[PDB]
Every structure is written in C-alpha cells, then in structure tokens.
Amino acid sequence: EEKEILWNEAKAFIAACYQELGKAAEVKDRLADIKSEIDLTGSYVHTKEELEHGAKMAWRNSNRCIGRLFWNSLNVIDRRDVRTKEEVRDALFHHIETATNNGKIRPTITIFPPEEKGEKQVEIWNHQLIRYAGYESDGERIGDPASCSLTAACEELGWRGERTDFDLLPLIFRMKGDEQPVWYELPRSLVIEVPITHPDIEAFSDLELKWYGVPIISDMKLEVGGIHYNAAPFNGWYMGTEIGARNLADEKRYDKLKKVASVIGIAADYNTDLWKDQALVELNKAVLHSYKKQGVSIVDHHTAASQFKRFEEQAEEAGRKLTGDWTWLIPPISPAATHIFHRSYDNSIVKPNYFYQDKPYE
Amino acid sequence: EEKEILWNEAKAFIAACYQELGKAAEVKDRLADIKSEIDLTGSYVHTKEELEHGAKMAWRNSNRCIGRLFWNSLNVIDRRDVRTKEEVRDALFHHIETATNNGKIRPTITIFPPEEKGEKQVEIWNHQLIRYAGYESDGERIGDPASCSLTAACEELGWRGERTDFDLLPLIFRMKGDEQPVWYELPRSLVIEVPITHPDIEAFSDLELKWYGVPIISDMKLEVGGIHYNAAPFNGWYMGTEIGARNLADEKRYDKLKKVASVIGIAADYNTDLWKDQALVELNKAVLHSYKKQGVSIVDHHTAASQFKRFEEQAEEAGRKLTGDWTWLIPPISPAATHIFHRSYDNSIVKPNYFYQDKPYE
Numbered sequence: 001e002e003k004e005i006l007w008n009e010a011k012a013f014i015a016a017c018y019q020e021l022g023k024a025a026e027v028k029d030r031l032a033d034i035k036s037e038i039d040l041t042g043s044y045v046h047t048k049e050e051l052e053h054g055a056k057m058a059w060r061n062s063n064r065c066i067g068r069l070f071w072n073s074l075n076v077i078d079r080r081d082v083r084t085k086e087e088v089r090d091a092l093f094h095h096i097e098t099a100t101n102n103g104k105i106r107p108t109i110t111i112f113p114p115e116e117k118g119e120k121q122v123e124i125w126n127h128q129l130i131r132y133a134g135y136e137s138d139g140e141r142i143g144d145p146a147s148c149s150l151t152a153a154c155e156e157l158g159w160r161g162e163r164t165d166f167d168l169l170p171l172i173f174r175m176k177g178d179e180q181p182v183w184y185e186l187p188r189s190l191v192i193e194v195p196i197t198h199p200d201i202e203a204f205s206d207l208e209l210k211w212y213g214v215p216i217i218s219d220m221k222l223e224v225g226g227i228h229y230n231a232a233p234f235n236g237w238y239m240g241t242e243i244g245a246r247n248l249a250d251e252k253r254y255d256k257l258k259k260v261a262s263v264i265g266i267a268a269d270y271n272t273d274l275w276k277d278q279a280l281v282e283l284n285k286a287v288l289h290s291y292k293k294q295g296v297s298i299v300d301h302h303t304a305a306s307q308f309k310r311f312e313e314q315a316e317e318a319g320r321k322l323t324g325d326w327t328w329l330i331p332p333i334s335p336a337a338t339h340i341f342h343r344s345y346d347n348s349i350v351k352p353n354y355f356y357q358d359k360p361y362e
Numbered sequence: 363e364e365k366e367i368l369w370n371e372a373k374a375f376i377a378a379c380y381q382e383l384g385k386a387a388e389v390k391d392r393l394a395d396i397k398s399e400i401d402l403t404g405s406y407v408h409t410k411e412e413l414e415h416g417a418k419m420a421w422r423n424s425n426r427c428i429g430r431l432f433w434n435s436l437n438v439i440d441r442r443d444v445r446t447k448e449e450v451r452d453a454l455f456h457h458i459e460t461a462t463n464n465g466k467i468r469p470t471i472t473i474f475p476p477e478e479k480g481e482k483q484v485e486i487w488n489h490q491l492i493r494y495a496g497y498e499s500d501g502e503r504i505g506d507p508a509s510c511s512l513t514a515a516c517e518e519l520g521w522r523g524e525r526t527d528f529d530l531l532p533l534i535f536r537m538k539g540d541e542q543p544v545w546y547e548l549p550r551s552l553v554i555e556v557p558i559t560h561p562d563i564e565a566f567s568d569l570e571l572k573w574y575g576v577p578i579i580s581d582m583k584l585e586v587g588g589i590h591y592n593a594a595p596f597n598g599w600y601m602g603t604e605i606g607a608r609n610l611a612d613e614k615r616y617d618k619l620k621k622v623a624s625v626i627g628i629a630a631d632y633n634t635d636l637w638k639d640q641a642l643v644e645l646n647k648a649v650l651h652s653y654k655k656q657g658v659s660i661v662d663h664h665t666a667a668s669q670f671k672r673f674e675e676q677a678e679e680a681g682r683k684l685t686g687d688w689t690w691l692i693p694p695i696s697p698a699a700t701h702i703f704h705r706s707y708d709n710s711i712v713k714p715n716y717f718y719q720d721k722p723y724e
C-alpha cells in the first residue's frame with residue numbers, strides 16, 4: 001500500500017510536470033518505467049529535469065511565500081550522489097558560497113538523497129545553515145532565543161559558543177547509520193554579515209546590531225511526486241521586515257525596540273506616542289539601507305508585494321489556481337498599504353511543496 | 363416552521379441569558395409564556411433586561427471587535443415604542459448627543475422595533491449616523507469614496523451636498539408603509555469634529571484634515587433569541603488606526619499619504635525609504651494627539667490590544683469560549699507588536715451577535 005500512495009502521487013506529478021515542460025507525449029512511457037521501478041524496488045528515481053522542475057513547482061505552491069514570482073529561476077543543485085559527511089559538509093559549504101554570490105544572492109536549493117523507507121539518508125539539524133546561537137542561564141539571556149534548544153544540543157556534542165550575541169552556530173547533521181550528528185564550524189570567509197546603520201541617524205551604530213546576508217532554510221522537507229527529500233536546504237534574499245520587524249523586534253527575539261527608540265531620540269513612555277511603531281520604521285529603514293550599502297540583495301515589503309501581485313496575474317494568465325496564506329503574506333508593518341491586505345486567498349495545499357517535519361532535538 | 367426557528371433560538375437565548383444574570387430558576391416559566399406567545403402571535407417580546415443583556419452578549423460575540431473588554435458596560439436605549447419618523451429622527455439625534463457626551467464618549471446602542479414577518483418597521487440607510495459624503499464626476503473626486511453610492515441616493519431624494527471634502531450626510535431612513543425614505547439634515551451642534559494637527563510638526567495643519575468624533579454604525583442587524591432588530595445603531599470610541607491608517611490612508615478612501623510625506627518633509631520616491639510607513643506613523647500620531655487635545659475619547663492600538671488580552675483572560679476565567687477573527691483583530695499598523703498577531707482565534711459565530719444585512723440602495 002506504501003507502493004500505492006507513491007504510485008498515485010507519481011502519476012499526478014509526472015502528468016503535470018510533463019504538461020508544463022511540453023513533454024506531454026512522453027508521460028505514458030515514463031509512467032510505465034516508474035510503475036515497474038516501484039514494483040521491483042519500492043521507489044523511483046527522478047530525472048534531473050523532473051527534480052529541478054519539481055523543486056520549482058514546490059516553491060510556486062508555498063502559500064506563505066510572498067516572493068514566489070521568481071519560482072522558475074530557482075537554481076537547483078542535484079546532490080543525490082553524496083554518501084559521506086565530508087561530502088554533505090562540502091555541499092553545504094558550496095551552497096552558502098554560490099547562493100551568496102558576493103552579495104548578489106542567487107535563490108538556490110541543494111537536494112540531498114531522499115528518504116528510503118522513510119529512513120533518512122541525511123538529517124540536517126540546523127533550521128538555517130547560517131544562524132546565531134542563543135543562551136539562557138541564571139537570568140542572563142544572550143543571542144537569539146529562537147536558537148536556545150539547538151545551541152544546547154550542539155553544546156552537548158562538544159561545541160562551545162563564545163557567548164556573544166552573534167555566535168555563528170556550526171553546521172550540524174546526522175548521517176544514516178550514525179547515532180550522533182557531527183558538527184562543523186562555519187568558515188567565516190563564507191559568511192557575509194551586514195552591520196546595521198541608519199541613513200541619517202549616526203548614533204544608530206551604537207546599538208552594534210548586525211545580521212547575516214543569506215537566509216538558508218535547512219530543516220524543511222521537499223515533497224515531489226511521492227518522493228520525500230527531507231534534506232533540501234533552500235534560500236532567497238531577505239525581505240527587510242523579516243529582520244527589522246521580527247528578528248530584531250520581537251520580545252522573544254532580540255527585543256531591540258526600546259533601544260532603537262533611545263538612539264533615535266524619542267521617549268518610550270506612552271503607547272499614544274506610537275514609539276514602537278516609529279522605532280519599527282526607522283529600524284526597518286536602517287536594515288534596507290545597510291544591505292543596499294554593502295551590496296547585499298534585499299527587498300522591501302512594498303516592492304515585494306508588487307512582485308507578488310504580478311505572480312497573481314501570471315498565475316491567472318497561465319490558467320493556474322492561486323493559493324496563499326493571507327496571515328503570512330501580509331507584511332508585519334503597514335500591511336494595509338499593500339494590495340495583499342485587501343483581498344483573500346485560498347489556503348489549499350498543492351503538491352509539490354515544502355513541509356514542516358519533526359525535529360531530532362527537543 | 364418559522365415559529366420553530368424562533369422557538370429554538372429563544373430557548374437557547376433565555377437559558378443562557380438567565381444563567382448569566384443568575385435568574386436560572388425563572389427560565390421554565392418565562393419559556394412557557396414565550397411558547398404561548400409564539401403560538402398565538404407568531405413572535406415574542408423581550409423584557410428590558412433580556413434586550414439589554416442580549417445587546418451586551420452580541421457585542422461580546424463580535425469576532426472582529428478588539429474593544430470587547432467593556433461589553434458589559436454598554437449603554438442600552440430601548441426605543442421599541444417609536445411609531446413615527448419624527449420619533450425615529452429624535453431618537454437618532456438623542457443617540458448622537460448622549461453617546462458623544464461632550465467628548466467623553468459613552469458606548470451606546472439605540473434599539474428600534476424589530477422585524478415582524480421579516481417586515482422592517484424602521485429601515486436605516488446610513489452606514490453611520492455621522493459620515494462624510496462622496497462624489498465622483500468628470501474625473502473629479504470629492505469627499506469619501508466609500509459614501510459615493512449613498513450620496514447619489516440622497517441626491518435622488520432632493521438633498522444637495524456642498525461638495526466639500528467633508529459634507530455631513532443627512533440622516534436617511536424609511537418607515538414601514540412608506541415607499542421612499544425621508545432625510546433630515548444633521549444639526550451641527552450635535553456633531554463634534556476634530557481638526558488633525560501634529561504634536562511637533564506645525565505644517566501638518568496645512569493638510570486641513572479632520573474627522574468626526576463618534577463612529578455610530580447604523581446599518582447592521584442585531585439578532586437576539588430569534589428576534590431580528592434590523593435597526594439598532596451602536597457606537598464605541600475610535601481606535602486611532604481606523605482613521606489614520608485606513609480612512610485617511612487607503613487609496614480608495616482619502617488617500618493622503620503622499621501629502622503627509624510632503625508636510626513631514628520626506629521624499630515619496632522610493633519604496634526602500636519606507637515613506638508610506640513613516641507617513642502612516644506620523645499621521646496616526648497626529649490623530650491620537652488631536653483627539654486627546656480636544657478631549658474626545660480615543661484609544662491607540664497597543665492599549666486596545668492590551669485591553670483585548672484582558673478580555674481573553676476574562677473569558678477564560680468565566681468559562682466562556684473565546685471567538686475572534688484574526689484578520690480583523692490585528693491592527694493595520696505594527697500588528698506584530700501586539701500579542702494578537704502571535705496567537706490564533708476560533709472564528710465560530712455565536713449568537714446573540716451583530717450581522718451584515720442587504721442595503722436598500724445600490
């Protein structure tokens with residue numbers, strides 16, 4: 001019956017994928033070979049064309065993503081050939097390098113061997129390949145609280161963080177047949193960081209804020225035609241709000257709004273002064289300004305929303321249903337200033353897609 | 363069967379209402395009289411206590427409302443005795459006066475006779491008792507575009523607006539047995555308006571912006587225990603964002619953000635400058651400052667969210683399920699700065715409640 005779910009998903013994917021690539025006449029024969037392959041082996045292997053397009057379809061189907069306009073230009077790196085942790089490590093190093101591209105970020109996905117019997121070949125522990133550590137001890141909070149549990153896990157494995165507010169977490173992943181994951185410290189030369197300054201508030205640098213250049217989500221599962229690629233790290237460029245309105249602003253993150261209000265010279269005493277709102281705007285202006293100044297790719301929420309409007313228009317022209325999660329698509333600042341706020345979206349799940357999966361820690 | 367829906371709703375309402383008022387032992391007898399009344403008359407008449415509490419329950423059940431903490435302090439005016447348009451007019455005039463309360467706004471509802479056979483005794487055309495007219499002709503747009511259709515309707519009835527950007531629409535309602543609605547010009551002495559100034563940007567007054575003091579929604583239907591009060595205008599005080607981030611900001615409303623950016627001395631050329639976001643903050647600061655300065659009640663979105671958190675806490679303590687519409691509860695500026703953004707809400711509809719109903723114009 002496991003050979004039935006896989007067979008059904010495969011038929012749906014191959015038909016759709018080959019339609020879009022204009023290879024509709026080759027569906028019948030390809031479906032034949034797959035049918036035999038599932039019978040004989042219990043699974044099937046995607047061609048590079050299928051895998052590449054499947055990854056692109058998956059991004060296109062990500063309801064929560066505002067940046068889906070450029071789904072078809074995704075850079076897909078096929079690494080189903082890896083067998084050693086050294087190979088996984090170097091593939092992850094390479095992903096960071098090519099995606100970063102000296103600041104001109106290339107949306108990229110590196111695809112590792114898929115689950116077999118639901119048995120993972122490679123199991124990545126990082127939420128993102130580049131992320132800051134977090135510590136909580138004796139009322140003392142350091143770094144990114146979102147990373148507290150992974151950090152403690154890494155420190156259980158012999159790693160020790162310097163306990164700055166911006167410790168780079170090591171890459172940590174487990175190979176099939178190993179009981180523990182291994183960890184590799186990130187070469188700093190691969191990691192671009194952006195110091196946060198303000199275009200006209202000189203004192204903003206006193207906050208000593210910074211963030212990393214490329215968000216590379218590495219703990220989600222890519223599903224393509226019944227095949228579960230549990231290890232397939234992917235990246236885009238940041239939307240400024242992710243950093244300015246969430247990462248550095250949330251009380252359960254870096255919680256910097258009070259300090260921003262201070263350096264911009266406004267009181268943080270009264271709700272009616274809207275000091276949090278003002279601090280959010282200046283901080284988000286600072287983030288955008290800082291990334292542009294260092295020549296690292298970034299998009300503001302207005303421009304991103306305009307691009308998403310075009311994605312909507314493109315979907316209609318192509319005859320494809322549009323799906324989306326309104327609650328995630330709206331930016332966390334001035335959402336009513338975007339068209340997204342003023343329309344509704346069908347939150348139906350279409351495959352191929354990227355999914356949450358259980359963590360091996362916590 | 364119409365006597366069945368009514369009977370079922372009545373049983374559910376009376377039981378619940380009398381539980382909450384601690385009059386549980388009187389349910390059986392009250393349900394008896396109602397049962398006979400429905401048999402004999404085809405409907406039933408609420409006691410003043412039931413009507414008052416039903417209106418309060420309805421507010422408490424309004425999923426989209428962030429101000430529900432004060433549901434139990436609602437001022438309920440029972441006007442089921444009205445029979446003439448002069449009486450309706452004076453009741454509406456009175457509502458404006460008492461709710462305004464010289465600026466110290468009292469949340470108030472005036473309840474008119476309910477539908478009979480679904481036949482309306484009184485039919486209010488206004489969306490709000492106080493609202494600005496809107497005009498669209500020859501590429502010339504004046505006033506509030508949201509009011510374009512009602513304004514044209516009023517001008518079909520012999521009314522003529524001065525075509526300022528802030529023409530007060532007349533009260534317009536239709537009595538049962540009349541073919542046309544009547545209209546009465548609002549006495550200016552009853553209407554408080556607030557000129558919009560900025561606490562430290564003196565040039566802000568050049569925009570000549572203003573808004574009315576009290577939002578009195580007058581086109582929704584109150585449903586209590588099977589009884590349809592189609593005419594029951596109600597009001598609270600404004601949350602600043604309604605005016606600053608929507609009414610004066612929406613492109614399909616007053617569309618003032620470009621002009622705000624000008625008077626606050628920032629460029630409106632680049633999305634990356636976040637000029638819309640900055641303009642929104644200053645405009646919303648101006649609104650709050652202006653209402654406080656004139657001694658007209660208003661609440662900022664942070665304070666309102668804190669109050670709503672208490673409503674959530676109060677609901678749990680009372681053993682009542684909480685319902686809400688996340689998409690409407692989140693404020694249109696800095697929503698992620700409120701707790702509302704970071705939790706989910708069950709959007710189930712509980713009666714008593716306030717409902718949309720079809721308009722007699724358009």
Ligand code: HEM
Nearest residue numbers: 059062064065066067107234235236237238239242299354
């Ligand atoms: C090219 C630049 C991109 C931008 C600006 C962008 C923007 C965003 C943003 C702002 C979010 C919300 C993140 C959050 O609230 O935590 C998001 C979610 C998401 N994006 Fe994108 N994105 C981009 C590229 C991509 C790529 C390349 C993929 C994968 C192929 C992708 C897949 C997703 C997914 C799966 C989510 C939802 C994750 C979740 O459910 O938690 N996006 N995107």
Ligand code: HEM
Nearest residue numbers: 421424426427428429469596597598599600601604661716
């Ligand atoms: C006391 C001050 C109050 C504040 C600050 C407040 C705040 C709000 C706000 C901001 C909205 C959203 C409006 C929009 O987006 O168009 C809302 C919706 C609503 N409020 Fe309140 N409210 C208050 C009192 C009341 C009262 C007295 C009632 C009725 C008894 C009420 C019932 C509702 C209803 C029914 C809606 C939704 C209307 C719709 O679905 O379009 N609220 N409230």
Ligand SMILES: C=NCc1cncc(OCc2ccc3ccc(N)nc3c2)c1
Nearest residue numbers: 067127215217220235236237238239242
């Ligand atoms: C832990 N935060 C929730 C979470 C969980 N699991 C995956 C997540 O991904 C968010 C996400 C995913 C893809 C992105 C692509 C580009 C971008 N700028 N941000 C992006 C953000 C977020």
Ligand SMILES: C=NCc1cncc(OCc2ccc3ccc(N)nc3c2)c1
Nearest residue numbers: 429489577579582597598599600601604
């Ligand atoms: C036409 N705009 C949509 C709409 C339709 N029908 C009713 C509406 O009511 C919004 C509403 C309702 C009650 C309120 C009470 C207080 C307040 N400050 N705003 C309030 C706003 C809104």
Ligand SMILES: C[C@H](O)[C@H](O)[C@H]1CNc2nc(N)[nH]c(=O)c2N1
Nearest residue numbers: 340341342343344689690691692
């Ligand atoms: C599409 C969406 O339902 C619609 O634009 C809503 C979004 N949330 C809102 N929330 C409030 N308070 N008021 C509104 O008018 C809207 N508009």
Ligand SMILES: C[C@H](O)[C@H](O)[C@H]1CNc2nc(N)[nH]c(=O)c2N1
Nearest residue numbers: 327328329330702703704705706
């Ligand atoms: C409760 C709600 O689902 C949750 O807080 C969501 C709201 N919308 C969001 N939207 C984005 N883009 N990112 C988030 O983390 C969240 N949080």
Ligand SMILES: [Cl-]
Nearest residue numbers: 215242243247
């Ligand atoms: Cl992030």
Ligand SMILES: [Cl-]
Nearest residue numbers: 577604605609
């Ligand atoms: Cl309004």
